[PDB]
Amino acid sequence: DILLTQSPVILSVSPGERVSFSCRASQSIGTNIHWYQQRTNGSPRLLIKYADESIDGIPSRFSGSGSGTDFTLSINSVESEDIADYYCQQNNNWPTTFGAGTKLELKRTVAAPSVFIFPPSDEQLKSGTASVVCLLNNFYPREAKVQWKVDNALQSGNSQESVTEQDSKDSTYSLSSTLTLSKADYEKHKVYACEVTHQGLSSPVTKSFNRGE
Amino acid sequence: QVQLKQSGPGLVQPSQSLSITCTVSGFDLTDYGVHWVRQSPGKGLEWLGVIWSGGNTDYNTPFTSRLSINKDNSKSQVFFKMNSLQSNDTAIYYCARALTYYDYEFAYWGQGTLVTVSAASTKGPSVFPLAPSSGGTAALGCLVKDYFPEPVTVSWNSGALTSGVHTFPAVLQSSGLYSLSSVVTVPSSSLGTQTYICNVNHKPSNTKVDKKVEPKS
Numbered sequence A: 001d002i003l004l005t006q007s008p009v010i011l012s013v014s015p016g017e018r019v020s021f022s023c024r025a026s027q028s029i030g031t032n033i034h035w036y037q038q039r040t041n042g043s044p045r046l047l048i049k050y051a052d053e054s055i056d057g058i059p060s061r062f063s064g065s066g067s068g069t070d071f072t073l074s075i076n077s078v079e080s081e082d083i084a085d086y087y088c089q090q091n092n093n094w095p096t097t098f099g100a101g102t103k104l105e106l107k108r109t110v111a112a113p114s115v116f117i118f119p120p121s122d123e124q125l126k127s128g129t130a131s132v133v134c135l136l137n138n139f140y141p142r143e144a145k146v147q148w149k150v151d152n153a154l155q156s157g158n159s160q161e162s163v164t165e166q167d168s169k170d171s172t173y174s175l176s177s178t179l180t181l182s183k184a185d186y187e188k189h190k191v192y193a194c195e196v197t198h199q200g201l202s203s204p205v206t207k208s209f210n211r212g213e
Numbered sequence B: 001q002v003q004l005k006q007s008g009p010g011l012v013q014p015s016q017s018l019s020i021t022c023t024v025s026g027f028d029l030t031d032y033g034v035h036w037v038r039q040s041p042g043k044g045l046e047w048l049g050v051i052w053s054g055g056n057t058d059y060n061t062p063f064t065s066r067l068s069i070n071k072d073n074s075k076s077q078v079f080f081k082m083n084s085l086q087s088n089d090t091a092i093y094y095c096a097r098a099l100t101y102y103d104y105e106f107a108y109w110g111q112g113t114l115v116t117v118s119a120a121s122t123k124g125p126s127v128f129p130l131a132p133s134s135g136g137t138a139a140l141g142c143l144v145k146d147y148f149p150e151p152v153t154v155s156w157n158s159g160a161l162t163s164g165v166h167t168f169p170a171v172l173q174s175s176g177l178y179s180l181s182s183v184v185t186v187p188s189s190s191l192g193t194q195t196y197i198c199n200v201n202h203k204p205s206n207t208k209v210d211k212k213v214e215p216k217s
Helices: A122-126 A183-187
Strands: A004-007 A010-013 A019-025 A033-038 A045-049 A062-067 A070-075 A084-090 A102-106 A114-118 A129-139 A145-150 A159-163 A173-182 A191-197 A205-210 B003-006 B010-012 B018-025 B034-039 B045-051 B057-059 B067-072 B077-082 B091-098 B106-109 B113-117 B126-130 B137-147 B153-156 B165-167 B178-187 B197-202 B207-212
Touching (some): A004 A084, A010 A019, A019 A033, A019 A084, A019 A102, A033 A062, A045 A062, A045 B106, A070 A084, A114 A191, A114 A205, A114 B137, A122 A129, A122 B126, A129 A145, A129 A183, A129 A191, A129 B126, A129 B137, A129 B178, A145 A159, A173 A183, A173 A191, B003 B091, B018 B034, B018 B113, B045 B067, B045 B077, B057 B067, B137 B197, B153 B178
Parallel strands (some): A010 A102, B010 B113
Antiparallel strands (some): A004 A019, A019 A070, A033 A045, A033 A084, A062 A070, A084 A102, A114 A129, A129 A173, A145 A191, A191 A205, B018 B077, B034 B091, B126 B137, B137 B178, B197 B207
């Protein structure tokens, strides 16, 4: 089977820049390459067929070039909504095969998170478990640190977090961290605090609540 | 308009079979092949096979002895069946149609079917409110906890509220169940007038829950 090698693995660029994706085939495939965009939680979207041919409904900023083994997808002036994984596909040789993808990330200015803390619901506490959630909204860059404290005891290992993909309009991330305790432990303590460190903040931000206030 | 709509996500037990239906519209199955492609978590695409206009099939080499594709032209349905699933067959499965009857440039795709291969039980989520508390903006949300397998869909106000929504990737907890949060930021002055409902659907367990979220008294 033909192996397609896409480079780079991750491409990080600013809005308005020209960007190029490389796809290299293990042997010559003529111009029998097609390209796809796949946005977060989306289906692939055909951008270019047969190396350089346009597809109805695809913006003019997308174009393709190449012949033989070395192919290029170009976005001439990248827009925030172009964040996606990009894949090449060959079909000179059966079976049709796809590259492993290049992920396009967009740079933007530093933006501090807005931080919010949520106590566990009374409904959940009936179940015997307390989830405490700290939300870091619309920030950049992606790196951030959440530290949980319960009555000034540092919590370690009993939280999980996840981060959204970059927003298609503003290129920010958001992050949710969930601290999980038993009901019994939750009701034995008063001060629940999430401390957030981020490049955009001159000092760490703490959001806290007192249980029962 | 050309569309391909696939059956819902769900769990397959190891060594058992996967069955997916792709229902097409805006073209006739007698005029186009329908292809199947999967995508393993965090990976690229793998072409599995095709049922052509006239009913012939081709299967990619790894799948020739365990895949069958059939169709019903009169019902615009294509049936994908794969036997003997193992863990590493966990993937999003897609049906797809090419631009031209004989070709492989996939202009039209199904929405995908997430198939999880695991020995575990299907379990529906509990939904808890992330209540707003006291720059004019409030955040609120829903915690969708303790479900299996993925995925869950969350909308707000029956799809009418999309601005400011962030639905997070699920985390796998040490229990082997998923948990996810979905949040939205809204004007604080809307909290007394507007209702905020998160609509949660876990198709694998046929669990739909609408949860109202509001300031705690």
